[PDB]
Design an enzyme around this catalytic site. Structure first.
Site, PDB file in Angstrom:
ATOM      1  N   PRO A   1      45.238  35.121  35.132  1.00  0.00           N
ATOM      2  CA  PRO A   1      46.627  35.480  34.776  1.00  0.00           C
ATOM      3  C   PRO A   1      47.412  35.970  35.983  1.00  0.00           C
ATOM      4  O   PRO A   1      46.965  36.868  36.702  1.00  0.00           O
ATOM      5  CB  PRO A   1      46.546  36.587  33.725  1.00  0.00           C
ATOM      6  CG  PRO A   1      45.153  36.347  33.127  1.00  0.00           C
ATOM      7  CD  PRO A   1      44.299  35.945  34.343  1.00  0.00           C
ATOM      8  N   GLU A   2      48.583  35.382  36.193  1.00  0.00           N
ATOM      9  CA  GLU A   2      49.464  35.773  37.289  1.00  0.00           C
ATOM     10  C   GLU A   2      50.742  36.343  36.640  1.00  0.00           C
ATOM     11  O   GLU A   2      50.885  36.298  35.412  1.00  0.00           O
ATOM     12  CB  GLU A   2      49.748  34.558  38.196  1.00  0.00           C
ATOM     13  CG  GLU A   2      48.451  33.935  38.757  1.00  0.00           C
ATOM     14  CD  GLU A   2      48.656  32.833  39.813  1.00  0.00           C
ATOM     15  OE1 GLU A   2      49.744  32.743  40.428  1.00  0.00           O
ATOM     16  OE2 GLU A   2      47.700  32.059  40.038  1.00  0.00           O
ATOM     17  N   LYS A  59      50.411  42.287  37.922  1.00  0.00           N
ATOM     18  CA  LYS A  59      49.571  41.750  36.852  1.00  0.00           C
ATOM     19  C   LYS A  59      49.019  42.892  35.989  1.00  0.00           C
ATOM     20  O   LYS A  59      47.923  42.802  35.428  1.00  0.00           O
ATOM     21  CB  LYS A  59      48.423  40.945  37.476  1.00  0.00           C
ATOM     22  CG  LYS A  59      48.908  39.856  38.445  1.00  0.00           C
ATOM     23  CD  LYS A  59      47.806  39.477  39.443  1.00  0.00           C
ATOM     24  CE  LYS A  59      48.284  38.450  40.472  1.00  0.00           C
ATOM     25  NZ  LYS A  59      47.243  38.201  41.526  1.00  0.00           N
TER      26      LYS A  59
END
Length: 293
Positions: A1-2, A59
């Site tokens: 996940p970015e 993040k």
């Protein structure tokens, strides 16, 4: 996940979870993911509180409750947010299909809210970090983060002046959450490809024109991915993102070959024809060998 994926999870939470009281809480028995507090203390602390808003930096996501401490989520490589209870939703990656176990056996943070709405943070790889802090932004890791790529963009001149002192190749610099926060592997490849800068180019060697091009590409890539709530199917076709995952030899973009350079454990998809490594020979050599440090 970015950044884009974490931001979509943030908006999914605000869509139906705001102003609702936490009626039941299940904190997983994972002393690796649940950091700095026992699950029962965690559960007792937030039970009965209302969720005012969802926040994000880089993040890292955290819930602003009516009163602190606040729960924070460091996604890691497989962290995810899931919301069940409201049939219609604008955030598809957070919806839960009836055939899925629920709560998931991968749930680390789970709460049942008013109106039967249930929210869960899951982590299949166990690389995520869940904390309960008096103020998430005052202590690590959020306090050590550099400016948010979306919320606190440096100006063109600020960007250039900071890069001038950075004596490391640009790819790992972009991944360094302490320099700028939120950029990961695919956004890095995308902005470098877009700006026509090679991943081994030292940041301090970038000219004024290169810094501005990179500044512009970071802005466009981040703004577009967020605009479409991290739905890659909506990413412009001319982005290297789409073919960045294809086998070597059959990866092209806009008709040009894509190669994969791996320096110090980091792999970058780039277009040799359009991303050239610049500088004197010995500096290019030092950059190629930088991973030795």
């Amino acid at each position: 996940p970015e950044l884009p994926e974490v931001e979509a999870a943030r908006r999914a939470i605000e869509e139906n979870c705001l102003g609702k009281k936490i009626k039941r809480v299940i904190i997983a028995d994972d002393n690796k993911v649940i950091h700095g507090i026992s699950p029962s203390d965690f559960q007792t602390s937030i039970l009965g509180k209302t969720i005012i808003s969802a926040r994000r930096k880089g993040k890292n996501l955290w819930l602003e409750l009516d009163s602190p401490p606040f729960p924070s989520f460091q996604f890691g490589m497989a962290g995810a947010i899931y919301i069940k209870g409201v049939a219609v939703t604008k955030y598809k990656r957070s919806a839960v299909k009836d055939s899925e176990e629920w709560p998931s056996k991968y749930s680390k943070f789970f709460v049942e809210l008013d109106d039967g709405l249930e929210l869960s943070f899951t982590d299949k790889r166990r690389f995520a970090k869940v904390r309960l802090l008096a103020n998430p932004t005052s202590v690590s890791p959020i306090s050590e983060l550099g400016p948010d790529a979306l919320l606190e963009p440096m100006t063109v001149d600020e960007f250039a002046e900071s890069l001038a002192k950075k004596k490391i190749t640009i790819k790992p610099l972009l991944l360094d959450q302490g320099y700028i926060s939120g950029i990961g592997n695919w956004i890095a490849d995308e902005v470098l490809y877009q700006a026509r800068i090679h991943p081994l180019q030292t940041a301090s060697s970038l000219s004024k024109e290169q810094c501005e091009a990179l500044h512009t590409s970071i802005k466009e890539v981040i703004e577009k991915a967020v605009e479409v709530d991290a739905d890659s199917s909506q990413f412009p076709s001319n982005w290297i993102f789409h073919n960045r995952e294809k086998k070597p030899g059959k990866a092209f973009v806009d008709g040009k070959k894509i190669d994969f350079i791996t320096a110090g454990g980091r792999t970058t998809a780039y277009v040799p024809e359009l991303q050239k490594l610049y500088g004197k020979c010995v500096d290019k050599l030092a950059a190629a060998l930088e991973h030795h440090h």
